[PDB]
Design a protein around this nucleic acid. Sequence first.
RNA 1: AGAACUUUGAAGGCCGAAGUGGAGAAGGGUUCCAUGUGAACAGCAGUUGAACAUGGGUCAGUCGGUCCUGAGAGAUGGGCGAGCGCCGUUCCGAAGGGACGGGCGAUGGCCUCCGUUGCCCUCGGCCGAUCGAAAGGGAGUCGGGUUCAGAUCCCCGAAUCCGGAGUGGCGGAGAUGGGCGCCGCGAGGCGUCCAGUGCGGUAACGCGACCGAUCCCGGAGAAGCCGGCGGGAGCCCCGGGGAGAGUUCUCUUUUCUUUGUGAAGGGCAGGGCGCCCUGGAAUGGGUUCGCCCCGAGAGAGGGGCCCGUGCCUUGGAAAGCGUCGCGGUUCCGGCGGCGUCCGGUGAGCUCUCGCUGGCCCUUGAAAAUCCGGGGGAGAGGGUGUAAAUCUCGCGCCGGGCCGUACCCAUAUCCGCAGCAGGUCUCCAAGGUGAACAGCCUCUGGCAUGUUGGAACAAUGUAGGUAAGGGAAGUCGGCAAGCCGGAUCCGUAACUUCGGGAUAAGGAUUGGCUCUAAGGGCUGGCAGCCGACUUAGAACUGGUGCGGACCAGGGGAAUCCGA
RNA 2: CCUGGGCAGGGCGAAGCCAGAGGAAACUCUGGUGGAGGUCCGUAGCGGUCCUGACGUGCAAAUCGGUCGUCCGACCUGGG
Lengths: 50, 114, 69, 120, 91
Amino acid sequence: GRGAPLAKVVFRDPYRFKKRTELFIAAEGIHTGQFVYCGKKAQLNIGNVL
Amino acid sequence: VQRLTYRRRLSYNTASNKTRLSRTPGNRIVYLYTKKVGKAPKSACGVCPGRLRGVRAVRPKVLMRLSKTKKHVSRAYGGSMCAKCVRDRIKRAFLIEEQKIVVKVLKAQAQSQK
Amino acid sequence: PRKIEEIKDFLLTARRKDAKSVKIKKNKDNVKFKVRCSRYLYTLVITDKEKAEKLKQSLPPGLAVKELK
Amino acid sequence: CRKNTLARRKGRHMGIGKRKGTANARMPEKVTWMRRMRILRRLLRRYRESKKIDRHMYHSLYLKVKGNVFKNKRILMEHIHKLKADKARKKLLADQAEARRSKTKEARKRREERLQAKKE
Amino acid sequence: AKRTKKVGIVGKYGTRYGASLRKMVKKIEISQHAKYTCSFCGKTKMKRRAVGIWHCGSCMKTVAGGAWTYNTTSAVTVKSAIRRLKELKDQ
RNA sequence: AGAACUUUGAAGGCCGAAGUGGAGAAGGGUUCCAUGUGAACAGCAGUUGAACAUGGGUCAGUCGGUCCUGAGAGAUGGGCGAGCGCCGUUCCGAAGGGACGGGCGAUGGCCUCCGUUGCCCUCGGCCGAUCGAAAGGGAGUCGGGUUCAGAUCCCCGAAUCCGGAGUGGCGGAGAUGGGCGCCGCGAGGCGUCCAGUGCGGUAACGCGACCGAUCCCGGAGAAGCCGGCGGGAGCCCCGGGGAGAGUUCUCUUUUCUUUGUGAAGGGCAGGGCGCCCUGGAAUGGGUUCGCCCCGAGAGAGGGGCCCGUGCCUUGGAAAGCGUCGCGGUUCCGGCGGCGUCCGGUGAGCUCUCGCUGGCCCUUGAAAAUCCGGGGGAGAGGGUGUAAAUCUCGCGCCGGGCCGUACCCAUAUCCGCAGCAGGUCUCCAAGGUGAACAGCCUCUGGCAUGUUGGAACAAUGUAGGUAAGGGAAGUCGGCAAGCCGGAUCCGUAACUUCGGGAUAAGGAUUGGCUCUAAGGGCUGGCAGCCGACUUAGAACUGGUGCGGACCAGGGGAAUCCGA
RNA sequence: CCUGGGCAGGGCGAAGCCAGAGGAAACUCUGGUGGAGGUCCGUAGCGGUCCUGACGUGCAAAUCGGUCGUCCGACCUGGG
Ligand SMILES: [Mg+2]
Ligand SMILES: [Mg+2]
Ligand SMILES: [Mg+2]
Ligand SMILES: [Mg+2]
Ligand SMILES: [Mg+2]
Ligand SMILES: [Mg+2]
Ligand SMILES: [Mg+2]
Ligand SMILES: [Mg+2]
Ligand SMILES: [Mg+2]
Ligand SMILES: [Mg+2]
Ligand SMILES: [Mg+2]
Ligand SMILES: [Mg+2]
Ligand SMILES: [Mg+2]
Ligand SMILES: [Mg+2]
Ligand SMILES: [Mg+2]
Ligand SMILES: [Mg+2]
Ligand SMILES: [Mg+2]
Ligand SMILES: [Mg+2]
Ligand SMILES: [Mg+2]
Ligand SMILES: [Mg+2]
Ligand SMILES: [Mg+2]
Ligand SMILES: [Mg+2]
Ligand SMILES: [Mg+2]
Ligand SMILES: [Mg+2]
Ligand SMILES: [Mg+2]
Ligand SMILES: [Mg+2]
Ligand SMILES: [Mg+2]
Ligand SMILES: [Mg+2]
Ligand SMILES: [Mg+2]
Ligand SMILES: [Mg+2]
Ligand SMILES: [Mg+2]
Ligand SMILES: [Mg+2]
Ligand SMILES: [Mg+2]
Ligand SMILES: [Mg+2]
Ligand SMILES: [Mg+2]
Ligand SMILES: [Mg+2]
Ligand SMILES: [Mg+2]
Ligand SMILES: [Mg+2]
Ligand SMILES: [Mg+2]
Ligand SMILES: [Mg+2]
Ligand SMILES: [Mg+2]
Ligand SMILES: [Mg+2]
Ligand SMILES: [Mg+2]
Ligand SMILES: [Mg+2]
Ligand SMILES: [Mg+2]
Ligand SMILES: [Mg+2]
Ligand SMILES: [Mg+2]
Ligand SMILES: [Zn+2]
């Protein structure tokens, strides 16, 4: 029901020892194994939500 | 020429009714039931797909029968990685730790010279 | 069932308790010895009638023996 | 049934009028191609593994068997014999020319040795 | 032998749904059924997954590409603008 | 007592494996079986039945429900509502009553050693109680025999799963080695110290076992559809043998029924690997039906792993089957002999497994359960003495409840009925044949479908013909009838260039002898064994050949809808 | 919506691939392989065009016999 691809981006919880798995909308040109960064001072590349 | 018959009352050709036919010692073709095929475990999330070698590919309720020889490999990350992942993760961990030590001693030289 | 290969292992099974049936089946080329100990059937097959006779001599007499015809 | 099957084995009762299906339904073209090309591709393996064809002409005749050129095993074997008889001449003439050139270069080197001995 | 001269891949449909529509579907069917050169392993094993997803056969590195091609020209323009605004005066 | 109909013998037929056959789900509820009657029922009849009366029949750890969630249904917190109640399923909730470890107090048993109670500290997202599949997921029973009615349930024989073990049932791992000083010829001994939570292979990985707590990660469960190809099984085909039977007017080493190994453990074939080592290619090479693969390592050589439903082995020949003979009135899963064998092949049909490809603005399910790995908090005897643990071989006990008969249908269901109506499934043989088409047979069923006898009038209902004309009948070629299969030629107007097209229009088609072509397996070109296909030639039958059945009449146009 | 089951055989021969020939190049021609499709003939299945046939106080308060359209799918169908 969606033509846009979903991206399964796993994170790391900064508070407890547990890997958190989230579901992002896949931007154009990302690939498996790319370190997707997220936060305020993240550097501006394709995939880095900021 | 001997047309054979079901033995349960599962009258439909579902996935659980996956059968075969054998021959009794009393000279009669019988309709004998078959367990569904179990697949071997695969690796962990990111390598080329392929079943791990040396694990008895059965149902996990049959895995209670199995001893601690036919469910894993004696190597570390044995029944989880196909050992190509092991020989890659060892080298990757070692190289990234050594390069972070190089970056740390470069920052220490920057502290000593600045 | 299981097939015991060694005569010493079969006679150790015969010495072992919780065993209530020893059967002897003669055949046209060999002879089969059956022990129904507990939920398993152990078979020693041997092709020498003299060895069968000396194993019958070395069989412990405290247990019944059924000869199949 | 056995008499009729013996007549079919001899080749009788198999005219044009007693064919009620198409030729692809009777003997499939895909099955004919599979049998034909499996035979024509394992005869080359029996040749290459034993003695006959070398490494390089095997791939050329392999592609030429994959193409629809060689009809059957007999003319495939005849074409392999023709290429072998051509290769024998092409290596015999090359070996004769190489022997003539090698003796000429050896004579030139020995004349260089004679002039070197005359100078020193 | 060249069996079809104009329809190309669209000859699996036949006589239906218009010459202009079949001509406009022809180019993108060639684009979705053509194998693309992988930029990671260097092979040409980019097999088409579902829409938006491309998948190289060797090394299993799945990439999020265009809907019918591997790279949209608009996507290349966006990538050039993003790297330009990246190295423009350090944010 | 009574026979067109009940039962048996025989004959002739039908259903003909997509069944008028053998069993199921829903539904019926005793209809299943035996005995007795025939006023009542069955559209006539009965000695018959699904009618009536009496008496029987359904046995489960390993078949299913019960467990799990799916779409969905749902109560509490909360809100609404005059009100029974309604909205909603994580929202606005103080919505975990559990375990490990430590400390303290008390009780009990043989107070040695252990098990609980009460308190404190520490840890611990439920994607939110609960329901929801007799076709989804879901551990583990198969072989022979038994009744008038049961069958994986009952008897015999042979196995497996899941729970339980406190004074911890028996073995085997962990387990027992090295160094030093002395005695003794020596085997060995004395005393001290130290190690020992298993080993091997370069590897992929293997073994009889291999300390593991909160926590984390991963896999299985857990995947669509359709082509191809290959392996295995079952059935079918052919040749030889063994047992029985049919025909013999003449012939036929002829024809027909049968010719066995279950679950489980081990060994070995066979299939597969995107699994490893040596090794470096180009004059590019290896393989497929198709692809595909190769410096991110091809060919080649040597190894490893998975499935092993295939063969052998314990089961297992003592049963089972065929055939011949012998005793018991009977009761006896009687008694004795022989056999239950050798091979070949497949565009053969069905099932299963595996490789690979195509399709997509379709990506083709969750949960319960179970396993592995990372982590080392802790645990244990400390040395001539044995534990902490065992996912190893055994030994002992238990597995509760519910359903189990029969029809599953042109007569046990629904339609007011023994109604040409309707209802979801598995198994499917021989010939002709492309075919699971149509036709005839075998295994298995049946009496022609709620009646029989006599005659063959009109009209009718279905089927087939008819001299000459061929649509002149009729609103209309309505109905009926011509071509129909296959092979070899040859195919128009138009067009979106794909089609139109099996266009149109011709020839052959039977039987019997031949000829040529299409393969495998051994030896360093020679020899043995089978396949049904194609093409060509002669001869012949009253031009007869798709000889039954199977089965496109065609062409030119107009309007509308792609 | 969820969860299951099913669809005999032949015809046309798309993409991709191989071989040969021509050309300076663009590329073209021929012979194969391939099996694509809301494709064609056709069975089971699903519906019901015509005979305005049979029945029409019927088998039936809508059925039957031929002739039928479609049959890899915008397909048919059980249960919740
Ligand atoms: Mg089930
Ligand atoms: Mg073809
Ligand atoms: Mg008959
Ligand atoms: Mg069928
Ligand atoms: Mg039937
Ligand atoms: Mg009855
Ligand atoms: Mg009576
Ligand atoms: Mg009556
Ligand atoms: Mg009654
Ligand atoms: Mg029992
Ligand atoms: Mg509610
Ligand atoms: Mg309330
Ligand atoms: Mg439930
Ligand atoms: Mg079960
Ligand atoms: Mg019964
Ligand atoms: Mg049984
Ligand atoms: Mg197959
Ligand atoms: Mg076979
Ligand atoms: Mg077995
Ligand atoms: Mg029953
Ligand atoms: Mg009826
Ligand atoms: Mg019916
Ligand atoms: Mg009615
Ligand atoms: Mg047949
Ligand atoms: Mg045939
Ligand atoms: Mg009658
Ligand atoms: Mg009737
Ligand atoms: Mg006339
Ligand atoms: Mg006439
Ligand atoms: Mg005329
Ligand atoms: Mg006229
Ligand atoms: Mg008129
Ligand atoms: Mg007509
Ligand atoms: Mg006529
Ligand atoms: Mg014209
Ligand atoms: Mg036309
Ligand atoms: Mg006009
Ligand atoms: Mg229309
Ligand atoms: Mg179609
Ligand atoms: Mg047409
Ligand atoms: Mg038609
Ligand atoms: Mg009708
Ligand atoms: Mg009418
Ligand atoms: Mg009337
Ligand atoms: Mg039809
Ligand atoms: Mg028709
Ligand atoms: Mg059609
Ligand atoms: Zn790649």
